[PDB]
Amino acid sequence: NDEEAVQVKEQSILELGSLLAKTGQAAELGGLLKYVRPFLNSISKAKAARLVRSLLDLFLDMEAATGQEVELCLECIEWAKSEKRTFLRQALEARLVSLYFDTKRYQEAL
């Protein structure tokens, strides 16, 4: 059925994203979350939010090009507010405040 195709497609997103995380890619892995934007609407918000948190954590743990990471997180919050996902943008801000915690920017974090 289609659910199996979505499952193998999601494990192919974790696979390709894992290979891009191994090859040290920043703009491609950062743009993959923007490329999978229409694909997340075909399934529930639980797996979509869990995938955004997964690729977000695995994308921030690489510690590469931290300048576009905060702006990309702001685009993910803007997109989550555009699609009216409260918990998604709440998790995105819950990780972004940790990004400001690592950046030692205590004004907008608090």
From Swiss-Prot:
Domain of life of the organism encoding this protein: Eukaryota
Modifications made to the protein after synthesis: Phosphorylated by AMPK.
Disulfide bridge positions per record: none
Localization per Swiss-Prot or TrEMBL: Nucleus; Cytoplasm, Cytosol
Expressing tissues: Highly expressed in embryonic stem cells (ESCs). Expression decreases as ESCs differentiate.
Induction: By FOXO4; expression in embryonic stem cells (ESCs) is mediated by FOXO4.
Its job: Component of the 26S proteasome, a multiprotein complex involved in the ATP-dependent degradation of ubiquitinated proteins. This complex plays a key role in the maintenance of protein homeostasis by removing misfolded or damaged proteins, which could impair cellular functions, and by removing proteins whose functions are no longer required. Therefore, the proteasome participates in numerous cellular processes, including cell cycle progression, apoptosis, or DNA damage repair. In the complex, PSMD11 is required for proteasome assembly.
UniProt similarity note: Belongs to the proteasome subunit S9 family.
Quaternary structure and interacting proteins, as annotated: Component of the 19S proteasome regulatory particle complex. The 26S proteasome consists of a 20S core particle (CP) and two 19S regulatory subunits (RP). The regulatory particle is made of a lid composed of 9 subunits including PSMD11, a base containing 6 ATPases and few additional components.
Protein's recorded name: 26S proteasome non-ATPase regulatory subunit 11
Organism: Homo sapiens
Residue window of the full protein shown: 38 to 147 of 422
